[model samples]
Target: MNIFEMLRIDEGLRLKIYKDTEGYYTIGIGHLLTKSPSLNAAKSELDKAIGRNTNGVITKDEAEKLFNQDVDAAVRGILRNAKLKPVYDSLDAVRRAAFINLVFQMGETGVAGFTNSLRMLQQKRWDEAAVNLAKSRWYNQTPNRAKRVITTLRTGTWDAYK
Candidate 1:
């Protein structure tokens, strides 16, 4: 199938998409992981399954599939949207995906709109970034989701990459 098909952009899979550049993108699975499709066709079927499940809600399965395509795409989505990559290069994939997942859930304009939060992340102020995330609009809509990402980034655990 296509990238959308392989990535499973339907149903309630909870697959969150992040825009890295003009064409590049990524997804974050948070604390969830799944058995990946063993074959190319199965991968496509998985994508369709996710689409059907989440109705494009986003999911861990979608994120897992994204990891197989290109690691940079997933991480880059957060960095590019945050506009913090130009100043920092020390960020890991998990950290990047944390932000990507946040943006995906919150929307670029919604998440990137956090100028202070962006500054904090760029400054590598992990705690402040987490605090800023909690104070944002997303926090009101998806408190648990934002909390998970904030906690993941703070502890440097949670395997956001998976």
Candidate 2:
């Protein structure tokens, strides 16, 4: 199964995982996010913290690797919880990915609150959909990340396929 498919989380489990990982206060390389270790001997210990069997960790050079993985899994959780199919019936592929990214950074219920915006997207009101997306609390919170996603949705760029 794909990584996201393997997770199969709902909002409750999603929250649980996020909350559970909150206590990991180690400033080490590839600690929880990646499978790397500060010391080779300590690798096993860190793996235990990350729960190897649960969230299979991998090493990557960039922050986006870990960030995107978590976000994609979180997005899958939202879709699964909502009983929504993976197919983007109303949302274009890029928009769906952007929405998933947003929901991943946030959470299911938090993103669900954008009912009006979702409705607008369903109606193909592109301008209003874009506006609603920009109005999100997360927009200004992560300006760079938000701008990148918004630009992808607007321009349909291949870079957004991540």
Candidate 3:
């Protein structure tokens, strides 16, 4: 269906910066750290976007809008990474969506840094790529989500997060 519905199912809804699985302050359905090179950047952007101070809250509709904006930027950034093109194009929709989730969790730069994982993916070595994903720092930081993604990547099946 819609990107917002897809992301909400994957990321869950949130109105506040409840430190995410990766230990980053996050709000609004996986809006990871934004507008930041400073401590207050996130707070400042959040306030401006939703009229919410540090402790303020947003409704699900507001969170969905923010998620759309954030994910649009993330997709743009991911598309610019030439190194990931082969693997990206080769994947089925389920695996491609998993990669997009990875890009959301780890920025384009971070995903690019998964050199071995990308290599395996490009080679069509699904098992190796899944292993690389499971061994990553991201997996350690967010195991459940990683498990879901790795399973999808390896099996080409959509296994909703459990």
Candidate 4:
């Protein structure tokens, strides 16, 4: 029911380097090395976070910290966007998680593109919002996860977590 559990289950954790669905180099719980401002700095931060030479390896504890940071980034991204802020302010904790999860999986810009859905959300038209979400390419690409998120928005509950 919590944001951590919701996001962790969806994003998963990887201790070693790997390519995400988009073929971006990601490591440590959805941390995108491919998008890093400084690759070496990111590498060193990961290494330091794990307290080891790393050689592409990160411990679960270390990975969890990175997960926390990434989730915070997602939250800030949602809050930072002018259009999303009002919709975000109107939501309960569980429904708020749905938007944060959306922002986490797809960038804020991606969520922003759901013009109709955002309008529905801002208007508290919960059921209508889900319809727009279901119509999105994001739903097309990741139907199951998008279904969970959409369900959260529609029902205003955390049944999807259980």
Candidate 5:
């Protein structure tokens, strides 16, 4: 499946303001408003990105736009990481998506912290890579999502399709 299709499922969508696990203000397909430059800036971008904004509610069309922008920025961030880019290049297409999705859920720095796991992935030790992921605190935080991502990385197949 395409990255957008994959992410839409994992991140899901919400039209109203809600707190994430960390109690951060997030909305519209997992958009982290707390990370925005400012609260006003956040609301303004959300309104611009999605058009109509009554209080905090948005529409599916707006959610789609936000998702696209967020996913694009995520992948771009992955590529810009000098240490991760080469490892990413060595992966097959399916594993590449899984890798990007993992980083999308967390961040490049979070993924980078798995130094040994990253090395295992770079070596194409898929099973070892999966093992390492399962052993991570990320797995505990989001076990189900982590399972699918790790499986995709291990098998080089889209978990949804498989």
Candidate 6:
């Protein structure tokens, strides 16, 4: 079995946020609570699941490690999409990373819905692709992030939105 499968069994996956035996707010696959930043990030997306706040927990580096792990998983999933594989493969490292980041943010299914954008990308129409991405619901929801992704797509640079 893979490491994730092992982790699933070992750590115990919890889809909903709940207090642990120690009364700490916890969620995911045995991601325990020790601090507030980790919980705050999880709670932002899982507001309805959280009933109370927790105290000091995981470190920022720990959180970054977890994020990187999640990003690796996301990249694997994105690479598995046959429809997007060719376009993704044709992109430079910067553009490839940008698409991966977009998939990581919006998810495979969500990114797949951008048919026109995907088409433009496949045709190497950078301008059209950026414009198409900017006109999406994803852009409407997160304009700043959208700008970064669009900019990266338009210009093949590693410059990120800050």
* Each prediction's TM-score versus the true structure: 0.49, 0.52, 0.83, 0.86, 0.86, 0.64
lDDT by residue for model 3 (1-162), tens: 334455677788888666666456678798865644454766776778876564456777888788888888877877777976677888777778777877876788888989999989878799988887888777887677778778877887765543
Each model's C-alpha lDDT? 0.51, 0.49, 0.75, 0.81, 0.80, 0.64
Predicted model with the maximum lDDT: 4
Q: Which stretches of candidate 4 lie over 4 Å from their true place?
A: 35-53
Superposition error at 60 for model 2 (Å): 3.8
Error of 3 at 64 (Å): 0.5
Q: What is the full ranking by TM-score, best candidate first?
A: 5, 4, 3, 6, 2, 1
Best by TM-score: 5
Q: lDDT tens digits, residues 1-162, model 2?
A: 222321222111221122123333222221233223334434454356444632323333222344445665666676676533332356666666666655654567676777776676667676666777788767766566666666655654536334
lDDT of 5: 0.80
lDDT of 4 by residue, 72-147 (tens): 9889988899978888998888899889888888888888888888888988898888887898778887788889
Clashes of 1: 19
Per-residue C-alpha lDDT of model 5 across residues 39-79, encoded as one tens digit per residue: 67667665765666656778788777788888888888889
lDDT over C-alpha atoms for residue 54 of model 3: 48
Residue-wise C-alpha lDDT for candidate 6, range 1-162, written one tens digit per residue: 232332343334455556654455665644544435456655653443233342323344444455456668667877898767777888887788778767765578888778888989988899988887887777886676578678878887745432
Runs of candidate 2 exceeding 4 Å displacement: 1-49, 52-72, 83-87, 159-162
Error of 5 at 33 (Å): 1.2
Per model, how many backbone clashes are there?
19, 0, 0, 0, 0, 4
Q: Measured by TM-score, how close is model 4 to the native structure?
A: 0.86
Which residue pairs collide in model 5, if any? none
Candidate 1 to truth, TM: 0.49
Worst 10 residues of 1 by lDDT: 3-12
